[PDB]
PDB file of all heavy atoms in Angstrom:
ATOM      1  N   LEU J   1     -83.146 -87.410   6.512  1.00  0.00           N
ATOM      2  CA  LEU J   1     -83.038 -85.968   6.423  1.00  0.00           C
ATOM      3  C   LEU J   1     -81.833 -85.321   7.104  1.00  0.00           C
ATOM      4  O   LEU J   1     -81.170 -84.463   6.519  1.00  0.00           O
ATOM      5  CB  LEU J   1     -84.321 -85.348   7.026  1.00  0.00           C
ATOM      6  CG  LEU J   1     -85.638 -85.816   6.365  1.00  0.00           C
ATOM      7  CD1 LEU J   1     -86.844 -85.234   7.117  1.00  0.00           C
ATOM      8  CD2 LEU J   1     -85.711 -85.458   4.874  1.00  0.00           C
ATOM      9  N   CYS J   2     -81.544 -85.744   8.352  1.00  0.00           N
ATOM     10  CA  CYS J   2     -80.672 -85.084   9.318  1.00  0.00           C
ATOM     11  C   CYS J   2     -81.318 -83.866   9.946  1.00  0.00           C
ATOM     12  O   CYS J   2     -81.610 -82.875   9.285  1.00  0.00           O
ATOM     13  CB  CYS J   2     -79.245 -84.694   8.843  1.00  0.00           C
ATOM     14  SG  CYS J   2     -78.166 -84.218  10.248  1.00  0.00           S
ATOM     15  N   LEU J   3     -81.525 -83.891  11.272  1.00  0.00           N
ATOM     16  CA  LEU J   3     -82.064 -82.750  11.976  1.00  0.00           C
ATOM     17  C   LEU J   3     -81.149 -81.536  11.936  1.00  0.00           C
ATOM     18  O   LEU J   3     -81.593 -80.421  11.667  1.00  0.00           O
ATOM     19  CB  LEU J   3     -82.374 -83.128  13.439  1.00  0.00           C
ATOM     20  CG  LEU J   3     -83.424 -84.252  13.580  1.00  0.00           C
ATOM     21  CD1 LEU J   3     -83.551 -84.686  15.045  1.00  0.00           C
ATOM     22  CD2 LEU J   3     -84.804 -83.840  13.039  1.00  0.00           C
ATOM     23  N   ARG J   4     -79.831 -81.711  12.171  1.00  0.00           N
ATOM     24  CA  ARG J   4     -78.924 -80.580  12.117  1.00  0.00           C
ATOM     25  C   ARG J   4     -78.612 -80.096  10.710  1.00  0.00           C
ATOM     26  O   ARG J   4     -78.702 -78.906  10.411  1.00  0.00           O
ATOM     27  CB  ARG J   4     -77.598 -80.905  12.829  1.00  0.00           C
ATOM     28  CG  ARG J   4     -76.715 -79.660  13.035  1.00  0.00           C
ATOM     29  CD  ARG J   4     -75.588 -79.880  14.041  1.00  0.00           C
ATOM     30  NE  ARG J   4     -74.449 -80.554  13.363  1.00  0.00           N
ATOM     31  CZ  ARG J   4     -73.363 -80.935  14.044  1.00  0.00           C
ATOM     32  NH1 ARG J   4     -73.332 -81.018  15.363  1.00  0.00           N
ATOM     33  NH2 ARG J   4     -72.255 -81.240  13.379  1.00  0.00           N
ATOM     34  N   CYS J   5     -78.238 -81.021   9.812  1.00  0.00           N
ATOM     35  CA  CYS J   5     -77.781 -80.698   8.478  1.00  0.00           C
ATOM     36  C   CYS J   5     -78.910 -80.419   7.496  1.00  0.00           C
ATOM     37  O   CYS J   5     -78.855 -79.456   6.733  1.00  0.00           O
ATOM     38  CB  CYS J   5     -76.878 -81.839   7.961  1.00  0.00           C
ATOM     39  SG  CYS J   5     -76.154 -81.573   6.323  1.00  0.00           S
ATOM     40  N   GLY J   6     -79.973 -81.247   7.484  1.00  0.00           N
ATOM     41  CA  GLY J   6     -81.144 -81.037   6.633  1.00  0.00           C
ATOM     42  C   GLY J   6     -81.021 -81.415   5.172  1.00  0.00           C
ATOM     43  O   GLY J   6     -81.949 -81.196   4.394  1.00  0.00           O
ATOM     44  N   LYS J   7     -79.887 -81.992   4.733  1.00  0.00           N
ATOM     45  CA  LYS J   7     -79.593 -82.140   3.314  1.00  0.00           C
ATOM     46  C   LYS J   7     -79.912 -83.538   2.772  1.00  0.00           C
ATOM     47  O   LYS J   7     -79.723 -83.812   1.586  1.00  0.00           O
ATOM     48  CB  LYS J   7     -78.104 -81.747   3.091  1.00  0.00           C
ATOM     49  CG  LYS J   7     -77.677 -81.508   1.628  1.00  0.00           C
ATOM     50  CD  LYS J   7     -76.324 -80.776   1.495  1.00  0.00           C
ATOM     51  CE  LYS J   7     -75.052 -81.609   1.750  1.00  0.00           C
ATOM     52  NZ  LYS J   7     -74.815 -82.580   0.663  1.00  0.00           N
ATOM     53  N   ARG J   8     -80.442 -84.440   3.635  1.00  0.00           N
ATOM     54  CA  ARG J   8     -80.735 -85.850   3.369  1.00  0.00           C
ATOM     55  C   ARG J   8     -79.506 -86.725   3.597  1.00  0.00           C
ATOM     56  O   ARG J   8     -79.383 -87.842   3.093  1.00  0.00           O
ATOM     57  CB  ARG J   8     -81.415 -86.176   2.009  1.00  0.00           C
ATOM     58  CG  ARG J   8     -82.251 -87.475   1.992  1.00  0.00           C
ATOM     59  CD  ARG J   8     -82.308 -88.131   0.606  1.00  0.00           C
ATOM     60  NE  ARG J   8     -83.385 -89.155   0.650  1.00  0.00           N
ATOM     61  CZ  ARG J   8     -83.711 -89.942  -0.371  1.00  0.00           C
ATOM     62  NH1 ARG J   8     -82.942 -90.116  -1.436  1.00  0.00           N
ATOM     63  NH2 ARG J   8     -84.885 -90.560  -0.317  1.00  0.00           N
ATOM     64  N   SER J   9     -78.546 -86.228   4.397  1.00  0.00           N
ATOM     65  CA  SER J   9     -77.227 -86.839   4.495  1.00  0.00           C
ATOM     66  C   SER J   9     -77.071 -87.694   5.741  1.00  0.00           C
ATOM     67  O   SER J   9     -75.967 -88.134   6.061  1.00  0.00           O
ATOM     68  CB  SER J   9     -76.076 -85.791   4.513  1.00  0.00           C
ATOM     69  OG  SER J   9     -76.292 -84.718   3.598  1.00  0.00           O
ATOM     70  N   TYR J  10     -78.162 -87.964   6.493  1.00  0.00           N
ATOM     71  CA  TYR J  10     -78.085 -88.785   7.685  1.00  0.00           C
ATOM     72  C   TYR J  10     -78.161 -90.240   7.307  1.00  0.00           C
ATOM     73  O   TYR J  10     -79.219 -90.773   6.986  1.00  0.00           O
ATOM     74  CB  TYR J  10     -79.217 -88.472   8.693  1.00  0.00           C
ATOM     75  CG  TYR J  10     -79.076 -89.217   9.994  1.00  0.00           C
ATOM     76  CD1 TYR J  10     -77.992 -88.964  10.849  1.00  0.00           C
ATOM     77  CD2 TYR J  10     -80.049 -90.152  10.386  1.00  0.00           C
ATOM     78  CE1 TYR J  10     -77.890 -89.621  12.082  1.00  0.00           C
ATOM     79  CE2 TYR J  10     -79.952 -90.809  11.621  1.00  0.00           C
ATOM     80  CZ  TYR J  10     -78.878 -90.536  12.472  1.00  0.00           C
ATOM     81  OH  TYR J  10     -78.807 -91.164  13.730  1.00  0.00           O
ATOM     82  N   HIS J  11     -77.025 -90.934   7.349  1.00  0.00           N
ATOM     83  CA  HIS J  11     -76.985 -92.361   7.213  1.00  0.00           C
ATOM     84  C   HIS J  11     -77.532 -93.079   8.436  1.00  0.00           C
ATOM     85  O   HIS J  11     -76.979 -93.001   9.536  1.00  0.00           O
ATOM     86  CB  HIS J  11     -75.567 -92.828   6.908  1.00  0.00           C
ATOM     87  CG  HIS J  11     -75.472 -94.301   6.725  1.00  0.00           C
ATOM     88  ND1 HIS J  11     -76.328 -95.075   5.975  1.00  0.00           N
ATOM     89  CD2 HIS J  11     -74.526 -95.135   7.206  1.00  0.00           C
ATOM     90  CE1 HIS J  11     -75.859 -96.344   6.038  1.00  0.00           C
ATOM     91  NE2 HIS J  11     -74.770 -96.428   6.785  1.00  0.00           N
ATOM     92  N   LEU J  12     -78.657 -93.787   8.252  1.00  0.00           N
ATOM     93  CA  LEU J  12     -79.416 -94.433   9.299  1.00  0.00           C
ATOM     94  C   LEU J  12     -78.695 -95.577   9.996  1.00  0.00           C
ATOM     95  O   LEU J  12     -78.695 -95.680  11.222  1.00  0.00           O
ATOM     96  CB  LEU J  12     -80.741 -94.972   8.701  1.00  0.00           C
ATOM     97  CG  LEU J  12     -81.732 -93.871   8.262  1.00  0.00           C
ATOM     98  CD1 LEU J  12     -82.824 -94.446   7.349  1.00  0.00           C
ATOM     99  CD2 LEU J  12     -82.374 -93.186   9.477  1.00  0.00           C
ATOM    100  N   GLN J  13     -78.049 -96.475   9.231  1.00  0.00           N
ATOM    101  CA  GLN J  13     -77.464 -97.685   9.780  1.00  0.00           C
ATOM    102  C   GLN J  13     -76.315 -97.429  10.735  1.00  0.00           C
ATOM    103  O   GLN J  13     -76.260 -97.993  11.827  1.00  0.00           O
ATOM    104  CB  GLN J  13     -76.993 -98.598   8.638  1.00  0.00           C
ATOM    105  CG  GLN J  13     -76.347 -99.920   9.093  1.00  0.00           C
ATOM    106  CD  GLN J  13     -75.945-100.746   7.869  1.00  0.00           C
ATOM    107  OE1 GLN J  13     -74.793-100.743   7.421  1.00  0.00           O
ATOM    108  NE2 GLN J  13     -76.938-101.452   7.283  1.00  0.00           N
ATOM    109  N   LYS J  14     -75.392 -96.520  10.369  1.00  0.00           N
ATOM    110  CA  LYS J  14     -74.256 -96.208  11.215  1.00  0.00           C
ATOM    111  C   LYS J  14     -74.522 -94.986  12.082  1.00  0.00           C
ATOM    112  O   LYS J  14     -73.654 -94.544  12.835  1.00  0.00           O
ATOM    113  CB  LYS J  14     -72.977 -95.956  10.382  1.00  0.00           C
ATOM    114  CG  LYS J  14     -72.597 -97.121   9.455  1.00  0.00           C
ATOM    115  CD  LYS J  14     -71.312 -96.834   8.655  1.00  0.00           C
ATOM    116  CE  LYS J  14     -71.173 -97.662   7.370  1.00  0.00           C
ATOM    117  NZ  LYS J  14     -72.035 -97.107   6.309  1.00  0.00           N
ATOM    118  N   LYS J  15     -75.744 -94.421  12.006  1.00  0.00           N
ATOM    119  CA  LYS J  15     -76.187 -93.284  12.793  1.00  0.00           C
ATOM    120  C   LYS J  15     -75.273 -92.063  12.709  1.00  0.00           C
ATOM    121  O   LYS J  15     -74.760 -91.555  13.706  1.00  0.00           O
ATOM    122  CB  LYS J  15     -76.520 -93.663  14.257  1.00  0.00           C
ATOM    123  CG  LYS J  15     -77.787 -94.524  14.383  1.00  0.00           C
ATOM    124  CD  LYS J  15     -78.080 -94.917  15.842  1.00  0.00           C
ATOM    125  CE  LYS J  15     -79.435 -95.614  16.056  1.00  0.00           C
ATOM    126  NZ  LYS J  15     -80.548 -94.636  16.074  1.00  0.00           N
ATOM    127  N   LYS J  16     -75.036 -91.571  11.484  1.00  0.00           N
ATOM    128  CA  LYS J  16     -74.092 -90.499  11.263  1.00  0.00           C
ATOM    129  C   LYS J  16     -74.465 -89.678  10.048  1.00  0.00           C
ATOM    130  O   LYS J  16     -74.841 -90.188   8.994  1.00  0.00           O
ATOM    131  CB  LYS J  16     -72.624 -90.978  11.126  1.00  0.00           C
ATOM    132  CG  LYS J  16     -72.408 -92.050  10.043  1.00  0.00           C
ATOM    133  CD  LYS J  16     -70.944 -92.192   9.589  1.00  0.00           C
ATOM    134  CE  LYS J  16     -70.448 -91.016   8.724  1.00  0.00           C
ATOM    135  NZ  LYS J  16     -69.085 -91.278   8.208  1.00  0.00           N
ATOM    136  N   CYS J  17     -74.401 -88.344  10.162  1.00  0.00           N
ATOM    137  CA  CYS J  17     -74.569 -87.491   9.011  1.00  0.00           C
ATOM    138  C   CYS J  17     -73.238 -87.248   8.334  1.00  0.00           C
ATOM    139  O   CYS J  17     -72.243 -86.876   8.957  1.00  0.00           O
ATOM    140  CB  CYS J  17     -75.197 -86.157   9.446  1.00  0.00           C
ATOM    141  SG  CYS J  17     -75.492 -84.982   8.094  1.00  0.00           S
ATOM    142  N   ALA J  18     -73.207 -87.463   7.008  1.00  0.00           N
ATOM    143  CA  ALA J  18     -71.998 -87.410   6.219  1.00  0.00           C
ATOM    144  C   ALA J  18     -71.397 -86.018   6.097  1.00  0.00           C
ATOM    145  O   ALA J  18     -70.196 -85.814   6.271  1.00  0.00           O
ATOM    146  CB  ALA J  18     -72.297 -87.970   4.818  1.00  0.00           C
ATOM    147  N   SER J  19     -72.244 -85.014   5.824  1.00  0.00           N
ATOM    148  CA  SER J  19     -71.797 -83.659   5.572  1.00  0.00           C
ATOM    149  C   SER J  19     -72.351 -82.782   6.662  1.00  0.00           C
ATOM    150  O   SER J  19     -73.476 -82.967   7.113  1.00  0.00           O
ATOM    151  CB  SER J  19     -72.227 -83.147   4.171  1.00  0.00           C
ATOM    152  OG  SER J  19     -71.638 -81.882   3.851  1.00  0.00           O
ATOM    153  N   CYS J  20     -71.520 -81.861   7.181  1.00  0.00           N
ATOM    154  CA  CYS J  20     -71.829 -80.925   8.249  1.00  0.00           C
ATOM    155  C   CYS J  20     -71.876 -81.596   9.603  1.00  0.00           C
ATOM    156  O   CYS J  20     -72.214 -80.986  10.616  1.00  0.00           O
ATOM    157  CB  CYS J  20     -73.095 -80.057   8.012  1.00  0.00           C
ATOM    158  SG  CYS J  20     -73.015 -79.141   6.434  1.00  0.00           S
ATOM    159  N   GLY J  21     -71.447 -82.872   9.671  1.00  0.00           N
ATOM    160  CA  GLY J  21     -71.511 -83.709  10.862  1.00  0.00           C
ATOM    161  C   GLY J  21     -72.882 -83.850  11.470  1.00  0.00           C
ATOM    162  O   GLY J  21     -73.879 -83.526  10.827  1.00  0.00           O
ATOM    163  N   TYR J  22     -72.897 -84.351  12.725  1.00  0.00           N
ATOM    164  CA  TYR J  22     -74.034 -84.756  13.539  1.00  0.00           C
ATOM    165  C   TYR J  22     -74.010 -86.278  13.571  1.00  0.00           C
ATOM    166  O   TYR J  22     -74.082 -86.911  12.518  1.00  0.00           O
ATOM    167  CB  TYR J  22     -75.423 -84.208  13.097  1.00  0.00           C
ATOM    168  CG  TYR J  22     -76.516 -84.295  14.123  1.00  0.00           C
ATOM    169  CD1 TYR J  22     -76.454 -83.517  15.288  1.00  0.00           C
ATOM    170  CD2 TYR J  22     -77.683 -85.032  13.860  1.00  0.00           C
ATOM    171  CE1 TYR J  22     -77.542 -83.464  16.170  1.00  0.00           C
ATOM    172  CE2 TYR J  22     -78.776 -84.979  14.738  1.00  0.00           C
ATOM    173  CZ  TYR J  22     -78.703 -84.191  15.893  1.00  0.00           C
ATOM    174  OH  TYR J  22     -79.796 -84.125  16.779  1.00  0.00           O
ATOM    175  N   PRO J  23     -73.845 -86.948  14.693  1.00  0.00           N
ATOM    176  CA  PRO J  23     -74.068 -86.440  16.037  1.00  0.00           C
ATOM    177  C   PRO J  23     -72.779 -85.888  16.599  1.00  0.00           C
ATOM    178  O   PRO J  23     -72.737 -85.536  17.775  1.00  0.00           O
ATOM    179  CB  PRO J  23     -74.495 -87.698  16.805  1.00  0.00           C
ATOM    180  CG  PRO J  23     -73.727 -88.825  16.118  1.00  0.00           C
ATOM    181  CD  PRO J  23     -73.795 -88.407  14.654  1.00  0.00           C
ATOM    182  N   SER J  24     -71.712 -85.772  15.787  1.00  0.00           N
ATOM    183  CA  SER J  24     -70.489 -85.083  16.168  1.00  0.00           C
ATOM    184  C   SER J  24     -70.709 -83.634  16.575  1.00  0.00           C
ATOM    185  O   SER J  24     -71.467 -82.906  15.937  1.00  0.00           O
ATOM    186  CB  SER J  24     -69.463 -85.084  15.007  1.00  0.00           C
ATOM    187  OG  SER J  24     -69.984 -84.440  13.835  1.00  0.00           O
ATOM    188  N   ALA J  25     -70.047 -83.156  17.649  1.00  0.00           N
ATOM    189  CA  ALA J  25     -70.174 -81.773  18.087  1.00  0.00           C
ATOM    190  C   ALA J  25     -69.619 -80.791  17.061  1.00  0.00           C
ATOM    191  O   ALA J  25     -70.233 -79.785  16.708  1.00  0.00           O
ATOM    192  CB  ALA J  25     -69.444 -81.582  19.427  1.00  0.00           C
ATOM    193  N   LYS J  26     -68.440 -81.132  16.514  1.00  0.00           N
ATOM    194  CA  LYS J  26     -67.847 -80.481  15.371  1.00  0.00           C
ATOM    195  C   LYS J  26     -68.703 -80.600  14.109  1.00  0.00           C
ATOM    196  O   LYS J  26     -69.364 -81.616  13.865  1.00  0.00           O
ATOM    197  CB  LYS J  26     -66.455 -81.107  15.114  1.00  0.00           C
ATOM    198  CG  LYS J  26     -65.544 -80.334  14.147  1.00  0.00           C
ATOM    199  CD  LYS J  26     -64.963 -79.060  14.781  1.00  0.00           C
ATOM    200  CE  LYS J  26     -64.294 -78.133  13.761  1.00  0.00           C
ATOM    201  NZ  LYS J  26     -63.843 -76.900  14.437  1.00  0.00           N
ATOM    202  N   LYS J  27     -68.704 -79.560  13.261  1.00  0.00           N
ATOM    203  CA  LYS J  27     -69.245 -79.601  11.920  1.00  0.00           C
ATOM    204  C   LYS J  27     -68.251 -80.239  10.950  1.00  0.00           C
ATOM    205  O   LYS J  27     -67.150 -79.734  10.728  1.00  0.00           O
ATOM    206  CB  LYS J  27     -69.569 -78.164  11.464  1.00  0.00           C
ATOM    207  CG  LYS J  27     -70.236 -78.031  10.088  1.00  0.00           C
ATOM    208  CD  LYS J  27     -70.433 -76.548   9.740  1.00  0.00           C
ATOM    209  CE  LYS J  27     -71.086 -76.288   8.377  1.00  0.00           C
ATOM    210  NZ  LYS J  27     -71.159 -74.829   8.128  1.00  0.00           N
ATOM    211  N   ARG J  28     -68.595 -81.397  10.344  1.00  0.00           N
ATOM    212  CA  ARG J  28     -67.676 -82.082   9.454  1.00  0.00           C
ATOM    213  C   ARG J  28     -67.664 -81.460   8.069  1.00  0.00           C
ATOM    214  O   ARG J  28     -68.674 -81.420   7.369  1.00  0.00           O
ATOM    215  CB  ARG J  28     -67.981 -83.597   9.325  1.00  0.00           C
ATOM    216  CG  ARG J  28     -66.843 -84.403   8.654  1.00  0.00           C
ATOM    217  CD  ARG J  28     -65.649 -84.690   9.582  1.00  0.00           C
ATOM    218  NE  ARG J  28     -64.453 -84.976   8.712  1.00  0.00           N
ATOM    219  CZ  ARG J  28     -63.420 -84.141   8.548  1.00  0.00           C
ATOM    220  NH1 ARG J  28     -63.268 -83.021   9.239  1.00  0.00           N
ATOM    221  NH2 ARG J  28     -62.444 -84.412   7.688  1.00  0.00           N
ATOM    222  N   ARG J  29     -66.499 -80.957   7.651  1.00  0.00           N
ATOM    223  CA  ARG J  29     -66.317 -80.332   6.369  1.00  0.00           C
ATOM    224  C   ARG J  29     -64.836 -80.328   6.074  1.00  0.00           C
ATOM    225  O   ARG J  29     -64.011 -80.728   6.893  1.00  0.00           O
ATOM    226  CB  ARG J  29     -66.892 -78.896   6.296  1.00  0.00           C
ATOM    227  CG  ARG J  29     -66.443 -77.975   7.446  1.00  0.00           C
ATOM    228  CD  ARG J  29     -66.904 -76.521   7.297  1.00  0.00           C
ATOM    229  NE  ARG J  29     -66.055 -75.899   6.231  1.00  0.00           N
ATOM    230  CZ  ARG J  29     -66.072 -74.592   5.973  1.00  0.00           C
ATOM    231  NH1 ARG J  29     -67.003 -73.769   6.426  1.00  0.00           N
ATOM    232  NH2 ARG J  29     -65.079 -74.020   5.299  1.00  0.00           N
ATOM    233  N   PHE J  30     -64.482 -79.918   4.855  1.00  0.00           N
ATOM    234  CA  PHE J  30     -63.174 -80.117   4.277  1.00  0.00           C
ATOM    235  C   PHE J  30     -63.045 -79.102   3.155  1.00  0.00           C
ATOM    236  O   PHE J  30     -64.042 -78.519   2.721  1.00  0.00           O
ATOM    237  CB  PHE J  30     -62.978 -81.568   3.751  1.00  0.00           C
ATOM    238  CG  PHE J  30     -64.280 -82.160   3.268  1.00  0.00           C
ATOM    239  CD1 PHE J  30     -64.862 -81.740   2.062  1.00  0.00           C
ATOM    240  CD2 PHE J  30     -64.980 -83.073   4.079  1.00  0.00           C
ATOM    241  CE1 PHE J  30     -66.132 -82.201   1.685  1.00  0.00           C
ATOM    242  CE2 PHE J  30     -66.246 -83.540   3.702  1.00  0.00           C
ATOM    243  CZ  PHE J  30     -66.823 -83.102   2.505  1.00  0.00           C
ATOM    244  N   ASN J  31     -61.823 -78.818   2.676  1.00  0.00           N
ATOM    245  CA  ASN J  31     -61.611 -77.704   1.772  1.00  0.00           C
ATOM    246  C   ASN J  31     -61.539 -78.095   0.307  1.00  0.00           C
ATOM    247  O   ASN J  31     -61.545 -77.220  -0.560  1.00  0.00           O
ATOM    248  CB  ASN J  31     -60.298 -76.966   2.117  1.00  0.00           C
ATOM    249  CG  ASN J  31     -60.434 -76.352   3.500  1.00  0.00           C
ATOM    250  OD1 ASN J  31     -61.381 -75.610   3.789  1.00  0.00           O
ATOM    251  ND2 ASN J  31     -59.464 -76.635   4.393  1.00  0.00           N
TER     252      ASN J  31
END
């Protein structure tokens, strides 16, 4: 799911949300 992002974008194995970041402090996005 991703607690911060909520979009189902939390990759479990590498422990990282693809879109909107998390566990990064910055929100990951691009133009």
Side-chain angles (χ1 to χ4, degrees):
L1 303 175
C2 192
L3 299 173
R4 191 165 82 184
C5 182
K7 194 165 76 71
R8 206 209 193 181
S9 319
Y10 186 65
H11 181 46
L12 292 164
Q13 180 179 97
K14 304 181 202 78
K15 290 179 172 281
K16 55 161 288 186
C17 181
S19 188
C20 305
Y22 197 67
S24 59
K26 193 74 192 176
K27 184 183 180 183
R28 193 77 202 108
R29 50 174 286 189
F30 31 73
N31 296 306

